[model samples]
Target chain A: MRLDLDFGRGLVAHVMLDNVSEEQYQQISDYFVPLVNKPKLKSRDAIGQAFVMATEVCPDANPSDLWHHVLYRIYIREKIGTDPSQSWVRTSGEAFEVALVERYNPVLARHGIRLTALFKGQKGLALTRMGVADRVGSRKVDVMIEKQGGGRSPDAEGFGVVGGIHAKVSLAERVSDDIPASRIMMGEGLLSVLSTLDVKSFPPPHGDLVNRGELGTPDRPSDKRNYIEGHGDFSACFSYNLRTSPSNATTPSGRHIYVSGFSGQDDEFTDYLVAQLA
Target chain B: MRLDLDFGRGLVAHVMLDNVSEEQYQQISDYFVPLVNKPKLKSRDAIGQAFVMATEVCPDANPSDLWHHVLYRIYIREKIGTDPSQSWVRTSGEAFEVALVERYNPVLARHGIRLTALFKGQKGLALTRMGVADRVGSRKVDVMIEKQGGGRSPDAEGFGVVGGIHAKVSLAERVSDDIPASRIMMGEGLLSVLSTLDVKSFPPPHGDLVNRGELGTPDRPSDKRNYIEGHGDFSACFSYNLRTSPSNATTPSGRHIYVSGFSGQDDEFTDYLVAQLA
Candidate 1:
């Protein structure tokens, strides 16, 4: 009865759902909707019946649907844990990470964009590689499996980092996206490593604009900068900020930086993730 | 087979579905999940089918569910209308107002925080009499259905807004509640009026520290001011900065400060309407 969010291991963080209450899960159950038309979780019919039927028929739902919930769920857990007397910290983060990958991987497959790595966190870093580490805690990024040919977007990054994702989570009911001061530590590490790759064949050449759009060193840069990555090659350069990818989605949670690595906007919580993934 | 957002006119900005690809609705569809256990929409069903089926059987979703969509739908419409260029304005503001009212009335009914009169935009004859309504826009406020009698919370303004309601929207791609200029003109004005109401009720009493916490004027004064309404009451007093309330929520859209006269956090884009409504 596990919903499938199979995004790669080294790149994804997996969390199991055995610890919380059904009531708590139900609170976040909205995000668990299966991508199938023949009835899904919203209709938790004959108990086991609905869950099992969903698996066989439901396709891979969008990763963001599950990913966003993961973050929100943590928020709920962390906040609810607050008694004023105790330091509150939600511990189910890994469960949500697992949920995101299980749900998102299928979306990539649907688009012909595929993956080839191990999702880290759940296992050993021995497989995900050096760049696979989450740099500053909020290093929410994903690897995009872009489909080739199909007339092209002229620039891979033209979409911008998952379209301007903000890691800003709300606390005190008013506070927004508080992360490990290190921010994109995981993403920066990932990006730094990706920068060293011999072949950057992924987001494609047009996507290069995202890489050189700023006033930084050869490896790191900003959006709309003087240093265009591929000459005037707008796509990839645009992608450095996630300016031109072909896909995007959302859910109730925040940690959406999936392996897609295509965020179409800028300065998002996803920047660090993209810095690494793209 | 409408998916039931029919929460009455004053509160639900009703939008009957018609055409376009699933893609079009997808742009604004995230707000349309069924409240059941069996899933919905992410299937994005057969083109028009998904878009339309989504409308029916959806149940009485939270007001923000439809209210927020009314705002987002406008964004999509305005943005889509951009024929290669123009200032493009998102339009569906009116509907969202209705949705907010429709949904919120029930909450008020739940608590009994009644209301009376109209909230208006400002000009400033002597300058501060009219609650000093924001003349330059960014009025970000909404018409709130103040629930009556819960005999709790101490002061109506004890909570400080956003802390009251549960967050009601998703993050990532489907998130679209941003706006510019003034956010909630009405709520601020309503706060101003409630400040002058001469009587602050509901919110109970135990939570009064927030009142004397600050110092200010008379009709439009702070917890310590001469014009302090109710002679000394404070729940409604703290409402000026959304400092107190029993409910709150957030959406991808900000214009939520629609005809409804209250907003939790701040700077939500509901100002445009307040400048116009109040």
Candidate 2:
């Protein structure tokens, strides 16, 4: 199915998968767990089947748990890109962002979701405009849909201005939310998903303070600051611009959701986005 | 001059040097900056003079900058106590409790602060209790005092229980109002103070993150979690309970102040503490 939003002569599509059988879900889970361990398997047909099954299960399965499996895949990609001896930047925020982009883009592409206007404006500026435009054009529309919908095809050049556009497009198509709300939901979902994974299998450092017993009382900022700062080479910050809002108007009773925004050099912009949405 | 906080029979005293020439501060700073560079000058007297001069200059100087000088002296003690390879722990949170005890007790004693009560609770809980009690009492009694305070004095038998005691004591002290606030100020002050020290003169890795671009942002939760979990050999949690209401009281702040709770085999606790604190 193709999904489209009203942004001056643009179209963004989301990929939809046929629902999988219970056996398929189990098989897919088994196959993907190993892929997280041995990423080379990611290229194998079995892995591809797992991916398809996961996508099929995503809508019905716990959104949070589904996203964690997705992160395991992206983590593999990061491991492949960087040296084992050299530390690579790792954070649930970063992992969530990476996974959202990786998992959704391919599925969106399969469904003919394309992007034309890549939102090339500065991060904070882009998000601000998108928020305003989204609110003005369709107050009822969710943030993810308003910001990411109505973009060109994924195959088109300059479809996404930054690394996270694909995920944005996916949310716009599937969720029909405005940018801020979509971003928040995405983050919340990712964290939920990551909790179910075998985080202990990876190594000593998993990027969650609560997981490490480093959580301090609300009075004291946790010591993980140094760790996060160290991992981003001390340059990282939370990505706010790319996140979605936690509240979903569709499911008024739904839990609040917050998505990860872009990290690294543009953290402040992300911070701005989060502030605006939050 | 002397600053004292009594914990029942024992007292926690801070020796304050009310006046010192700027020349003395500069001389002291210069002497220690290169001492770590010249191993030959690492003698007891050289280190002692550096400590005395720095300590003497502390009270009149900026409160935020005092802890660095004090911590540097503690670093020296640790260097003198163990092999250089293992010395990094001295500057870390693991040894922070003990180092504070060893470093400040003599000075505190000179000022007539009885550290015994600070170190007096249950075997593992005494010093922490005393530190917390004195800290809370001091904050209520004197809001102007601004040195970072924590530590447990070893028993007369020389078996060390001061570290745990200091942590527990501090927690007890913070149970009241004002003390947690004082601790927050002290923690922030220490950060500022320690930032001024020429960490380069301390050891490798001691100053590595501060000097290099490898470390990332200091504020993100994910980054903080990763830094603590990833850097050390044994992955475990460190706990320090705190009694004060959180700064942002609306949020539920968990226990503990600056350092994460303790982890690892009892002997390795020091190393884990160092890595987490580092």
Candidate 3:
């Protein structure tokens, strides 16, 4: 499948995922993972070749071993099936942040905006009614963009979060990929990224933003959802595409988003974003 | 040693470094280097504890393993010996970029600008040309809030580099460091941080921005300079305090930054920046 990206007008910078064809899965499981896991330099040749490929994906970079490391590292580590180092996704997120800015900061700047910090590990979290950001949500926030005066933190209750994107690169079997997301965890594809990106509610009286369509609950599994909560006018969730259900046009809380993934060049990921942010 | 960072107004967001004392030289030479050579697991526990310390350094992080990884990685790598594993510096730079944003992006955005991309390794170069940028010296650059459209790059032929800083964590011997900078390489303290940071100029026409001042010169044997080039600009030769030299106020090249280091709470690196950028 080809790579697809979207500016989502302004809410999300990038988001992508695709199912690996049988041969692709075999290629990763059979070759890539073990090569880099070992003691040393055997991967140098592969590294050079992959660097060229990665550079192709994001030519905007001045390009260096760091970029190459991330591009290939993610492919290899993801296939290996474990992230004891947890460095794979984190590194990919870092590399993408750099690439995204080079490719689009100028575009975003047109609006007096800039992608201040494309944080991953720590930049991950959401605001809860408790006034803290530790609500049960996305552990892996692939990307977040800050407005001219915006910045992010683990607990960003007051700061206005401008845009977002998450990396949901799981290759779960079609058999168990439904909702109630936590249940999906037991299947081949994991719920790590899903659980983090998709949420059911912000606890308490917060409106029910998830109903299977948003990558949660057990009813509308194949859909996506974006909810906006206005905390005394903090930010409107800019709700969109809620499985034919009524979008949350009026609620004032914090944004509690849920995402889904299934990759293919013709994918609607970009179009999906256009509805929320455009 | 304690960490000190600065957020000067209306310019680039950072500047740092301080000379190292004799006892500190023996400290790194004797310990930090050899520890990361291999046998990776010992570093995991160290990773957790370190997570805490680094979080202490930058308390604003959501405080995840990724943030902790960067906070301590740079310091640890700066002291540890060899980086056969380029992952250390690349990772540290990635982490620092995030930490830097959380710590300062808001302050920068207040001035109607944001540091879109703060590249290292590849973002290394210096120049000397008036037509390219505001020439006749670095003064105009010391503070420039851009038009509706403008940014920066390696060649930086047209962009004004408003500020500078070097990881001047030099380990020079009082005896030899007084002259050409290459000699400074041999002092009791090895430049582990320098190796990872400020790299060799892209080469040729671009002169090394170092001379115990700029990143380097062609003749500076052991050092690698991070130089950017313009049609005619070389380096303006900014040298300070180590043993003294006239500051290059009249020179017309890029901001030849020199960074030094000493992490003790007694460090005044930030205070110095307040003077230049505050």
The model with the greatest DockQ is: 2
TM-score of each: 0.21, 0.28, 0.25
Which structure is stronger by TM-score: 2 or 3? 2
Expressed as tens digits, the lDDT of each residue in A96-140 for candidate 1 is: 222223433454444433322223341223112323233212122
DockQ of each: 0.01, 0.02, 0.01
Q: Measured with DockQ on alpha carbons, how good is candidate 1?
A: 0.01
**Per-model TM-score (chain A alone):** 0.24, 0.28, 0.31
Task: Give per-residue CA lDDT, model 2, range A142-260, as digits (tens).
Answer: 11211122322222333321112322212211112222333332443211111011122112123221111121222333222221221111111221221222222322223222234
Best model per TM-score = 2
How far does residue B234 in candidate 2 sit from its true spot (Å)? 32
What docking class should model 3 receive?
A: incorrect
Per residue, candidate 3 scores C-alpha lDDT tens digits across A49-114 of: 343344444333223222322434345444332332444544443444444344344555544344
Docking class of 2: incorrect
